[PDB]
Scaffold this active site. Structure first.
Site, PDB file in Angstrom:
ATOM      1  N   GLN A  49       0.824  -1.196   0.000  1.00 47.54           N
ATOM      2  CA  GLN A  49       0.000   0.000   0.000  1.00 47.54           C
ATOM      3  C   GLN A  49       0.864   1.254   0.000  1.00 47.54           C
ATOM      4  O   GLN A  49       2.045   1.229   0.353  1.00 47.54           O
ATOM      5  CB  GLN A  49      -0.936   0.020   1.208  1.00 47.54           C
ATOM      6  N   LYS A  67      -0.146   7.579   6.478  1.00 44.69           N
ATOM      7  CA  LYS A  67      -1.113   7.008   5.548  1.00 44.69           C
ATOM      8  C   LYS A  67      -2.045   8.105   5.059  1.00 44.69           C
ATOM      9  O   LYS A  67      -2.872   8.603   5.839  1.00 44.69           O
ATOM     10  CB  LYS A  67      -1.904   5.881   6.212  1.00 44.69           C
ATOM     11  N   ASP A  86      -6.074   1.766   1.741  1.00 45.49           N
ATOM     12  CA  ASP A  86      -6.052   1.912   3.189  1.00 45.49           C
ATOM     13  C   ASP A  86      -6.790   3.184   3.587  1.00 45.49           C
ATOM     14  O   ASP A  86      -6.453   4.276   3.121  1.00 45.49           O
ATOM     15  CB  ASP A  86      -4.613   1.953   3.695  1.00 45.49           C
ATOM     16  N   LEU A 168       2.458   5.653  15.273  1.00 50.53           N
ATOM     17  CA  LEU A 168       3.715   5.671  16.007  1.00 50.53           C
ATOM     18  C   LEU A 168       4.477   4.365  15.826  1.00 50.53           C
ATOM     19  O   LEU A 168       3.910   3.273  15.909  1.00 50.53           O
ATOM     20  CB  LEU A 168       3.448   5.927  17.488  1.00 50.53           C
ATOM     21  N   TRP A 169       5.778   4.487  15.592  1.00 52.64           N
ATOM     22  CA  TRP A 169       6.645   3.330  15.444  1.00 52.64           C
ATOM     23  C   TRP A 169       7.087   2.829  16.810  1.00 52.64           C
ATOM     24  O   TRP A 169       7.427   3.620  17.694  1.00 52.64           O
ATOM     25  CB  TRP A 169       7.860   3.705  14.598  1.00 52.64           C
ATOM     26  N   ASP A 233      -8.624  -8.216   6.561  1.00 49.10           N
ATOM     27  CA  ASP A 233      -7.360  -8.297   5.838  1.00 49.10           C
ATOM     28  C   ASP A 233      -6.187  -8.665   6.741  1.00 49.10           C
ATOM     29  O   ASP A 233      -5.036  -8.383   6.397  1.00 49.10           O
ATOM     30  CB  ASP A 233      -7.079  -6.974   5.122  1.00 49.10           C
ATOM     31  N   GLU A 238       0.727 -10.060  13.921  1.00 48.86           N
ATOM     32  CA  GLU A 238       2.019  -9.628  14.421  1.00 48.86           C
ATOM     33  C   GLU A 238       1.947  -9.501  15.935  1.00 48.86           C
ATOM     34  O   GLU A 238       0.902  -9.161  16.493  1.00 48.86           O
ATOM     35  CB  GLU A 238       2.409  -8.310  13.782  1.00 48.86           C
TER      36      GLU A 238
END
Ligand SMILES: OC[C@H]1O[C@@H](O[C@@H]2CO[C@@H](OCc3ccccc3)[C@H](O)[C@H]2O)[C@H](O)[C@@H](O)[C@H]1O
Ligand SMILES: Nc1ncnc2c1ncn2[C@@H]1O[C@H](CO)[C@@H](O)[C@H]1O
Ligand SMILES: Nc1ncnc2c1ncn2[C@@H]1O[C@H](CO)[C@@H](O)[C@H]1O
Ligand SMILES: *[C@@H]1O[C@H](CO)[C@@H](O)[C@H](O)[C@H]1NC(C)=O
Ligand SMILES: *[C@@H]1O[C@H](CO)[C@@H](O)[C@H](O)[C@H]1NC(C)=O
Ligand SMILES: *[C@@H]1O[C@H](CO)[C@@H](O)[C@H](O)[C@H]1NC(C)=O
Ligand SMILES: *[C@@H]1O[C@H](CO)[C@@H](O)[C@H](O)[C@H]1NC(C)=O
Lengths: 349, 351
Positions: A49, A67, A86, A168-169, A233, A238
């Site tokens: 995406q 995004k 998305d 946020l990562w 989807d 994870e």
């Protein structure tokens, strides 16, 4: 008395919670995401995406995933349960629903109006900049470098102001591992095994990591979460893991809120086929159906603090209330075919 | 601008019936920093009470009142004569608030130290009832002696030039009223001896009458007696508590008559513990963690005290006193373990 938000974010995570109940700690992190200056910008990993990777300013640098907006707020998405681009507003709504239901397994997400000309282009890596174009109305757009990305399907701004969601990562101390979802879809016209065999859950609890531990009960939790938002989807789930356990996290929830009139009950297959349910979540679900304020009313009050509010139309909000009742029917049906003492499982999580 | 929460709103939403403050340093530091920098909009003082204090109204969307307790002694003054003599120590309120969180009680309202410019911040907004008590000392320092019961022109609180050091204590919201009842272990405040000073079996008498037969009240008083013993507060003749439908809790309010003497340990403050030989389970667990940690209680408390604007808060003597007083508490409870079995001393009420 100074604490920086990226430090709050690092110290906030435990193996069974990404975020906390404290609105003060969370608003502090969100406010930083909404206002931090972008120092670098690129495409990102790979994925299928269109997205961008921003490096936000601070004592330490904090990456977020951008995004962009790709649909109107009232687009109806038709086709496969996983159709469409998305939805950026779905990432925001799914994050607040994640906390409202007491999962706390979704990273913080904030909406933000990005000035592509002032904030992104001056710091954009060549890999991302070479994908900036203009449309027939002379809007600034970019189509990115990904698998489904191409010059004819770009994300476009209003003049130069592009609306989107920042995600946020997670810190490096919390690596993210990924495994195929036992109830993944086939992504072709064939049928997956769980679509033909109603006893499919028996086959899954044999192999690790579903024979013991919290994994299978996590997937049932996430299937309820995914059903409420319409996310069909999650073909690869994870999870994070340290010495004190593991937890499936609600990451990449953007393929949600596509159609407020359809309820893909196939998403509930982990619940309906296994007829197991963690006790702590079952208690929170009965609080949501018993509260004087409906689930949609409570969620929108949290959504009303985001910069790009409105986040969901009335239809998608009312969908949550209707799907919450469909979940209760699924669980009550398990109580009949087995027994409430054999469906409700207390693992103290 | 988005995502804003004001500190006074954080303070209002922070209180539950069994916690005044929370473990979150982010929420607490946010409230403390607001008190340390909020602009004073009003300042007054009331004729009531026995100690010199001021009432400040801090600025905000809503106005937030604090109690200002000025500095009255040097940092290393020794108070002797009776366990409860002296003025209210402003630095004691600060240390007692951080000790309250360090031990996991969370029953003390937030307290911050602050250097107040009396000429710039107080006088422009001072009610006449307070301004008329401003005087100067022999060195031309700005002072005020206030209107109270023991307040008089000859015993003022004095600044350095015009900058007065003190402690701000947060006022509880109206939704949490504070009730007051006499402490069963009151002192006599004369040469007569109290009944608990002559009768070692005194705890029998209290658990007969309400509200000590049922509920957490007696176990709360045992908790605060350990807290008061560590800080040296022998002046809690009336305890105070909040109450709603879901229970009650004795709060650590007005802890200023503490840290007066780092050389004596008034074990009479521990009388609720030593005479009843009961102890809430959760409190016992937190104490055994404090005695086992590699860093002593004093080292941990000073690390928390080091964030206050007017640090240093305590002299080295008072910090080392805490560690020694903690051992005397451990001795007191272990002595209960001998005369009654441990299964009858530790009470688990899930609080
Ligand atoms: O242009 C975007 C495009 O996105 C489509 O969604 C894709 C479909 O494939 C999913 O991954 C399937 C998969 C990949 C690897 C292993 C196993 C399965 C993606 O998650 C999903 O984003 C969408 O359906 C199309 O309409 C189209 O819009
Ligand atoms: N916020 C995030 N934090 C950490 N890893 C992520 C995040 N979002 C996506 N990923 C992972 O990085 C890749 C990006 O799609 C995938 O492997 C995905 O699992
Ligand atoms: N922070 C505070 N909040 C509410 N009431 C207080 C506070 N501090 C003192 N008081 C009350 O005011 C008086 C102080 O001497 C007592 O009646 C006490 O209960
Ligand atoms: C905003 O948009 C139009 C083009 O769509 C442009 O002509 C206009 O100048 C822009 N506004 C500013 C302030 O640059
Ligand atoms: C959980 O693990 C962390 C480190 O991963 C450790 O510091 C902590 O002590 C553990 N928690 C408990 C409750 O044992
Ligand atoms: C304090 O003292 C000196 C004179 O004694 C004066 O000049 C100074 O301005 C005073 N401080 C303030 C803040 O007024
Ligand atoms: C007491 O607890 C209940 C349930 O935990 C809660 O709904 C209620 O609000 C609490 N009481 C008050 C006065 O808030």
């Amino acid at each position: 008395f100074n604490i920086h938000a990226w430090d709050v974010w690092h110290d906030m995570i435990s193996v069974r919670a990404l975020t906390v109940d404290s609105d003060v700690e969370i608003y502090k992190v969100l406010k930083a995401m909404s206002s931090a200056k972008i120092t670098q910008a690129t495409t990102g990993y790979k994925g299928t995406q269109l997205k961008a990777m921003f490096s936000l300013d601070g004592p330490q640098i904090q990456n977020v995933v951008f995004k962009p907006k790709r649909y109107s707020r009232n687009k109806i998405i038709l086709g496969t349960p996983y159709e469409g681009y998305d939805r950026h507003n779905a990432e925001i709504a799914a994050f607040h629903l994640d906390r409202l239901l007491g999962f706390y397994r979704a990273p913080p997400v904030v909406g933000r109006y990005i000035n592509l000309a002032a904030e992104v282009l001056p710091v954009a890596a060549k890999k991302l900049a070479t994908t900036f174009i203009k449309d027939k109305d002379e809007n600034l757009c970019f189509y990115g470098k990904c698998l489904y990305c191409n010059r004819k399907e770009p994300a476009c701004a209003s003049n130069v102001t592009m609306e989107g969601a920042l995600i946020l990562w997670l810190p490096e101390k919390w690596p993210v591992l990924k495994l195929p979802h036992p109830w993944r879809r086939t992504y072709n016209k064939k049928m997956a095994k769980w679509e033909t065999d109603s006893h499919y859950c028996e086959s899954v609890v044999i192999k690790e990591p579903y024979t013991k531990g919290p994994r299978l009960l996590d997937l049932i939790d996430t299937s309820i979460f995914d059903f409420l938002i319409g996310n069909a989807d999650r073909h690869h789930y994870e999870y994070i893991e340290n010495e004190n356990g593991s937890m499936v996290i609600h990451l990449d929830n953007a393929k949600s809120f596509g159609n407020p009139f359809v309820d893909e009950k196939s998403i509930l297959s982990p619940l309906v086929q296994c007829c197991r349910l963690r006790s702590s979540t079952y208690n929170r679900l009965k609080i949501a159906t018993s509260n004087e304020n409906s689930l949609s009313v409570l969620l929108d009050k949290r959504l009303s603090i985001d910069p790009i509010y409105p986040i969901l139309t009335s239809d998608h909000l009312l969908a949550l209330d209707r799907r919450l009742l469909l979940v209760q029917d699924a669980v009550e049906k398990c109580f009949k075919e087995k027994n409430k003492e054999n469906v409700i499982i207390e693992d103290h999580l």
